[PDB]
RNA sequence: AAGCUCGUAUCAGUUUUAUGAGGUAAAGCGAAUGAUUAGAGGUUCCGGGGUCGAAAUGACCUUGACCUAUUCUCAAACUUUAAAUAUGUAAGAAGUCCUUGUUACUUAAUUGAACGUGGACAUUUGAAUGAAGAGCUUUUAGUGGGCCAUUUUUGGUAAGC
RNA sequence: GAGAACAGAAAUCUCCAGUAGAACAAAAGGGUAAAAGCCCCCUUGAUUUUGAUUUUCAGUGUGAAUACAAACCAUGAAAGU
RNA sequence: GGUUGCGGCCAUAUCUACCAGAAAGCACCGUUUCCCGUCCGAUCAACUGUAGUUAAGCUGGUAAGAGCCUGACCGAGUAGUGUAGUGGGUGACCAUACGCGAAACUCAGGUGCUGCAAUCU
RNA sequence: GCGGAUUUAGCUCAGUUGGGAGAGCGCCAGACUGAAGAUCUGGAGGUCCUGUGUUCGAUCCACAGAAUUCGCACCA
RNA sequence: CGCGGGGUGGAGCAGCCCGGUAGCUCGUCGGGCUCAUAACCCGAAGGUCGUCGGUUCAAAUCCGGCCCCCGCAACCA
RNA sequence: AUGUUU
């Protein structure tokens, strides 16, 4: 008895933060471009802190936002790398969740030493219908408490769908 | 040798000996800072009003 | 609540609330100041805004002026009035916006006695041209477009309503670089594409493309079109007839108002919770206190 | 060294009336000012253009000119032992219509009405205001109001 | 060398606290303001005795520390370390300045006189008003004479006139003893620390039920 | 000093009424900023150590910090509030109301703006008090070291500083 | 604050709270939240003419600033600026 | 009386936690050929009003609710302060006389009002 | 008291552009030598003069204080 | 302001006075020789010519700017 | 060409 309080993937963001801006960054860009099917966006470093050779605005990371069935499919493909089991600590209090994989080549196209091997970061932002209320230009509102996504609801939805399970507290 | 630097002592008494004078209000004050577009048209309006009032003596 | 909800007393005490219509996210006061503020050397001249709002299923087209007591509507036109002029589907599309602009323009000019003079663009070809002043005669009724918070894009329905009100004979200052058909690569607009949009050519082209593609989608969308037997090629003459009917009689017949305001109020007053009195609040507090004969 | 800038010593004068910061409400711009209207000057610190000098904060003058976004105000500034005419060009956010003469206009209208009704009904005018007069005699009753006797209280510390 | 207190007895200057514009202020001599059984509950110490200023003046931090030590030592040695709670209720926030005029005659040669005479931070002082409490001490009614004598001893360390006033309030609360007793018998007083919290007839009933089970 | 134009008359180191402006005195700190005393609840993700824990923080012990509700005391260069005194303006005939002429300005528009024509209103012509009158001009002297008293107040221990 | 491989206190990605506790060249004060802040697009009104005005003030100058007029422009859909 | 569009004053309107909402409106909601804009039709653009829902937004109600607002012989004629004395006091300061007169506090009440146009069981 | 200055592994110092603390002379270890000195190779070496503060960080961008010095301290 | 001159590996440097093409010595790294160092021998590393712009089948060199240094001379707001 | 000491 819940008309449209139906948890659904709002988006899935794939992220690869290379510590450098060299050819490795372009390689990671093409990696997370090929599976996403979209042009990704490089993320400039904001400081020059230490241990990374990063500097202000060096374009050290690359990420891509996927929605719809493509996001659902990339999620279901990245979940088998985790064997459809995730840590409870992976679930944010706002009802989102994520996981990290390594050796992206274990899906789709093989090693292809021209592109090399990369690890990737999967973050799934979960919402219900009516999330447009918070994002639209006009009459911007705040989703009500009963309608907010929670970790206690996202964990339950994540074991309902994908027939998965979670780990210790 | 140092000296006094400033004081307003006796200044109000000096000013009130001949008194603070209100600035003699006039009818028809000057149009100095008035908008020049308004003034340009006001000249024509006044010339026309003068001509009309002259002709109105028949 | 949490350590981040239920903000503290000092925060609540020092919070300055925005204007109510800024809290509601409805009025850009930065734009409203520049739309509404009049040259002080005119001393009474109302600045009229052609306010164009797009809700779901309805278009709001008003001509509004401002006063200290509040905005005053001069003439209003809605997209739910296009059925009277022979438009019953797509009541929020580009062509409906153009029709509503034409309707507000004709209605306002009639209200001001400027319908005969300033006929506007009666033979519309989709060309960029403003309502020109006639020689030895009153100037056209000037209104300034008010999008509100809707974005300025090339091809927006708000600029379709702008174009409709301009063609209707209202002087609405505007450029053409936001109309559909404007060639962003160059300095010119495609008048044939603008005319197509004015007459719903994009909607009818979609109708025929969807007919020659998956027919389930053409049965779901345009279901009312098939159930009213409206061919895609009939949209142009539908909009032509609508423009002619609008120019014929933009006189704003209002609805017949069944169940008059007294019974409207009486019916709505049943599903309305009333505020409790201070004695009722005291009784409720006393009841919650005395319910602890011991402690629950 | 010393410092006398244009906005020197205006730190509190040009502040925004705590919890009334931000955008100027539209009535300020919807006000209408004609040549001869009496206005009070109160600078809005959020509108830095057309701003009066700090001397004119709280001064009342007469509009002599009307421009696109501003009015010319005539102030009588005291300099030395006389008054000099000053012409300020103030944006309408820094001026409000003065109520220093609304009571006078209402008295003018009431006086015209009273004069008319008087020369219609009989012979009496009494059109000049009067200062608060000494109270008239009165009888004060004790029914339910028998006087209570108070005495000065002894000293105590209550600390 | 420290200048005698008579040079800074009176509130001749505006308050001059340590701030963004001083940055060079020496440490106050009195650093402890709560001593004795500062953890005792409000019920434990009903009697309050105040050492109250009768003059508008400035008390130095050195005088405050000396008087605190004197009073605490007397009350501790006569009645016990835990028989009282003494609180110093003035804080030396006003900075005193000194224009250091050179000794070692010939100073006039290497001296500009009163030129640039603005002084450097020299010490701290509390600015007390007439009727302002300087010391408060709560204790049991049986310890009245010991507490009053400790405050009378501390009085000798202060310039100006101070009065010993027995407070009609319960301990360090703002309620007169009959009213505190009435509220405690009514159950609208709960121990929080050495102080208490009072049940109000405002706020959420849920909170006023959780706290104060007087119902 | 010389006067000059007038004198039904003008104004005022004052009050009253009406209407503003101010951020000092006071006040406030369980209100923002900054200071500042103490105890009490939590946070073991408290900084964690010790101690066990085979080990984890897992238990404690504990100091630390944060968070919550309180508590003592403060600010020339803090502040929600906020005086007293002082201060701007108005209290009419150069006013108010009614009609309608000019314009190249302004309006969609005789719309408005400004200036007018014509018409109506003198006992209190629209508070109080006073007014060896009011207004105006020219031209020149000396002076341009100041000091003192109450009150406000800065530097200074202070000073007949 | 809560989350994501390397990745920890600091890298990048995500959500939530967030009256400004940030930023606006510099001193300080004021001002600013669909902005005056950040990012992006287009530009040269940092132009021409000669007046008026405010502060300092002798109601001189200089500096700075305000509101117009008469042009030519920029920008925006536009009001406007 | 509800609702929308535009509003005026800009918390009595805000904040937190719950509950309710008939009609209509608003809204979420469906689609990606076209105009347009995105890493992403999420936003923005367009199309449909059709497939669905009042879950959320929104509106209203509830709370010895936080905040805010109003008022008060509540505190308090207190603090402060204009004027006065060959008043007091070594002084610090203080009292008195003729006037003006707070803030905190306490308590009580309240929790948007309203303009134009349209629309609705 | 005024005007300058410089404070960094034990000693002398380089510093540091909003990084990251380094080079010699010492010291230790290991080589070579019958062995010592000499010489070679390495390695550790500081909580950057102090506290607090701007800061993503920042001895280094920056605030005041100290330590060691220099110079001046006159007309009577 | 004028007239001249100069800036090249870490350093001094020749190279330029009409492109055929960046070198000399020391210092630094390795080996040889020696019983071991020095000299010496054989190697190896170190610049693209202070910075811009221009002419030229292809410019350290020509041509003009900018910066820095030096020498002489010049001086009405 | 230089190569100290026991
Ligand atoms: K004493
Ligand atoms: Mg002297
Ligand atoms: Mg002099
Ligand atoms: Mg806008
Ligand atoms: Mg103010
Ligand atoms: Mg002083
Ligand atoms: Mg001497
Ligand atoms: Mg001040
Ligand atoms: Mg004070
Ligand atoms: Mg002289
Ligand atoms: Mg903007
Ligand atoms: Mg200057
Ligand atoms: Mg969508
Ligand atoms: Mg849209
Ligand atoms: Mg619901
Ligand atoms: Mg409440
Ligand atoms: Mg006297
Ligand atoms: Mg021997």
If you had to describe this structure to a student in words, what would you say it looks like?
The structure is cut from a larger assembly and holds chains A (169 residues), B (58 residues), C (296 residues), D (159 residues) and E (215 residues). By secondary structure, chain A is of the alpha+beta class. In chain A, 24% of the residues lie in helices and 21% in strands. Chain A is built from four helices and seven strands. Chain A has a five-stranded antiparallel β-sheet with strand order 2-3-1-6-5, with helices on one face. A two-stranded parallel sheet of chain A has the order 4-7. Chain A starts with 7 loop residues before the first strand and ends with a strand. Chain B is mainly alpha-helical. The longest helix of chain B is centred in the C-terminal third of the chain and has 20 residues. By secondary structure, chain C is an alpha+beta fold. In chain C, 38% of the residues lie in helices and 8% in strands. Chain C contains twelve helices and four strands, in the order H-H-H-E-E-E-H-E-H-H-H-H-H-H-H-H. In chain C, strands 3-2-1-4 form a four-stranded mixed β-sheet, covered by helices on one side. In chain C, a hairpin with a 6-residue loop joins strand 2 and strand 3. Chain E has a five-stranded antiparallel β-sheet with strand order 1-4-7-2-8, with helices on one face. In chain E, strands 3-6-5 form a three-stranded antiparallel β-sheet. Chain E has a two-stranded antiparallel ribbon with strand order 9-10. Chain E has 215 residues and is α+β, with helices and mostly antiparallel strands. Classes of the chains: A alpha+beta (169), B mainly alpha (58), C alpha+beta (296), D alpha+beta (159), E alpha+beta (215). Chains in contact: A-C, B-D, C-D, C-E, D-E. The structure holds potassium ion (K) and magnesium ion (17 copies). The site of one magnesium ion (MG) has 2 residues of chain B, from loops. The site of one magnesium ion has 2 residues of chain D, from loops. Chain C binds six RNA strands through helix 1, helix 2, helix 3, strand 1 and strand 2.
List keywords for this structure.
part of a larger assembly, 5 chains, B: 58 residues, mainly alpha, 2 helices, 47% helix, elongated, C: 296 residues, alpha+beta, four-stranded mixed sheet, 4 strands, 38% helix, 8% strand, globular, binds potassium ion, binds magnesium ion, RNA-binding, ubl conjugation (chain B), cytoplasm (chain B), structural constituent of ribosome (chain B), isopeptide bond (chain B), Large ribosomal subunit protein eL29 (chain B)
């Amino acid at each position: 008895q819940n008309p449209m309080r139906d948890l659904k993937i709002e988006k899935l963001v794939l992220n690869i933060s290379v510590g450098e801006s060299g050819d490795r960054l372009t390689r990671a860009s093409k990696v997370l471009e090929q599976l996403s099917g979209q042009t990704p966006v490089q993320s400039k470093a904001r400081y020059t802190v230490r241990t990374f050779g990063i500097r202000r605005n060096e374009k050290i990371a690359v990420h891509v936002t996927v929605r719809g069935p493509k996001a659902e499919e990339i999620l279901e493909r990245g979940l088998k790398v985790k064997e459809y089991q995730l840590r409870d600590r992976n679930f944010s209090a706002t009802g989102n969740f994520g996981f990290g994989i390594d050796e992206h080549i274990d899906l789709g196209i093989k090693y292809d030493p021209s592109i090399g091997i990369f690890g990737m970061d999967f973050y799934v932002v979960m919402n219900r219908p009516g999330a447009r209320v918070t994002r639209r230009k006009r009459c911007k509102g705040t989703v009500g408490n009963s309608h907010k996504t929670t970790k206690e609801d996202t964990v339950s939805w994540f074991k309902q769908k994908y027939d998965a399970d979670v780990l210790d507290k | 040798a140092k000296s006094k630097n400033h004081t307003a002592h006796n200044q109000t008494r000096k000013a009130h000996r001949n008194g603070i004078k209100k600035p003699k209000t006039y009818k028809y004050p000057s149009l100095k800072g008035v908008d020049p577009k308004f003034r340009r048209n006001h000249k024509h309006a006044l010339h026309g009003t003068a001509k009309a009032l002259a002709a109105a003596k028949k | 609540a949490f350590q981040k909800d239920a903000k503290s007393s000092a925060y609540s005490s020092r919070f300055q609330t925005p204007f109510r219509r800024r809290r509601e996210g409805k009025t850009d006061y930065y734009q409203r100041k520049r739309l509404v503020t009049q040259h002080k050397a005119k001393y009474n001249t109302p600045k009229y805004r052609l306010v164009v709002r797009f809700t779901n299923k309805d278009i709001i087209c008003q001509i509004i002026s401002s006063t200290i007591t509040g905005d005053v509507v001069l003439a209003a036109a809605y997209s739910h009035e296009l059925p009277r002029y022979g438009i019953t589907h797509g009541l929020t599309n580009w062509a409906a916006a153009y029709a509503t602009g034409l309707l507000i323009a004709r209605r306002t000019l009639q209200k001001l006695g400027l319908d005969e003079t300033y006929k506007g663009v009666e033979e519309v070809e989709g060309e960029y041209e403003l309502t020109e002043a006639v020689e030895d005669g009153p100037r056209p009724f000037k209104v300034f477009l008010d999008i509100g918070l809707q974005r300025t894009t090339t091809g927006a329905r708000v600029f379709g309503a702008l174009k409709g009100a301009s063609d209707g004979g209202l002087y609405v200052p505007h450029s053409e670089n936001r109309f559909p058909g404007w060639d962003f690569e160059t300095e010119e607009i495609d008048p044939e594409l603008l005319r197509s949009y004015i007459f719903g050519g994009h909607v009818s082209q979609y109708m025929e493309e969807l007919a020659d593609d998956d027919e389930e989608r053409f049965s779901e969308l345009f279901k009312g079109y098939l159930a009213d037997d409206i061919d895609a090629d009939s949209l142009e003459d539908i909009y032509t007839s609508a423009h002619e009917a609008i120019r014929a009689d933009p006189a704003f017949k209002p609805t017949e108002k069944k169940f008059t305001k007294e019974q409207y109020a009486a019916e709505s007053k049943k599903y309305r919770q009333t505020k409790l009195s201070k004695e009722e609040r005291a009784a409720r507090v006393a009841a919650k206190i005395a319910a602890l004969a011991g402690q629950q | 060294g010393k410092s006398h800038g244009y906005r020197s010593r205006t730190r509190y004068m040009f502040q925004r009336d705590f919890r009334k910061h931000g955008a100027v409400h539209l009535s300020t711009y919807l006000k209408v000012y004609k040549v001869g209207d009496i206005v009070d000057i109160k600078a809005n610190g959020s509108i830095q253009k057309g701003m009066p000098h700090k001397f004119y904060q709280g001064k009342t003058g007469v509009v002599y000119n009307v421009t696109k976004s501003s009015v010319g105000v005539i102030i009588n500034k005291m300099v030395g032992n006389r008054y000099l005419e000053k012409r300020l060009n103030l944006r309408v956010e820094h001026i409000k219509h003065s109520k220093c003469r609304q009571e006078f206009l209402e008295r003018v209208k009431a006086n015209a009405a009273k004069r008319a009704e008087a020369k219609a009904q009989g012979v009496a005018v009494q059109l000049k205001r009067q200062p608060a007069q000494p109270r008239e005699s009165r009888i004060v009753s004790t029914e339910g109001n028998v006087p209570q006797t108070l005495a000065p209280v002894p000293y105590e510390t209550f600390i | 060398a420290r200048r005698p207190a008579r040079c800074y007895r009176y509130q001749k200057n505006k308050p001059y606290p340590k701030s963004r514009y001083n940055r060079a202020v020496p440490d106050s001599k009195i650093r402890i303001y709560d001593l004795g059984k500062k953890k005792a509950t409000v019920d434990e110490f009903p009697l309050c005795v105040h050492l109250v200023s009768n003059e508008l003046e400035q008390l130095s931090s050195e005088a405050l520390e000396a008087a605190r030590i004197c009073a605490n030592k007397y009350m501790t040695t006569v009645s016990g370390r835990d028989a009282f709670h003494l609180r110093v209720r003035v804080h030396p926030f006003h900075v005193l300045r000194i224009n250091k005029m050179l000794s070692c005659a010939g100073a006039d040669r290497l001296q500009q006189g009163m030129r640039g005479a603005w002084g450097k931070p020299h010490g701290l002082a509390a600015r007390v008003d007439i009727g302002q409490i300087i010391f408060s001490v709560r204790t049991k009614d049986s310890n009245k004479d010991v507490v009053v004598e400790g405050l009378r001893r501390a009085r000798y360390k202060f310039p100006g006139q101070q009065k010993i006033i027995l407070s009609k309030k319960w301990g360090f609360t703002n309620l007169d003893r009959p009213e505190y007793l009435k509220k405690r018998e009514a159950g609208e007083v709960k121990d929080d620390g050495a102080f208490v919290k009072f049940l109000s007839k405002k706020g959420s009933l849920e909170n006023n039920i959780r706290e104060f089970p007087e119902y």
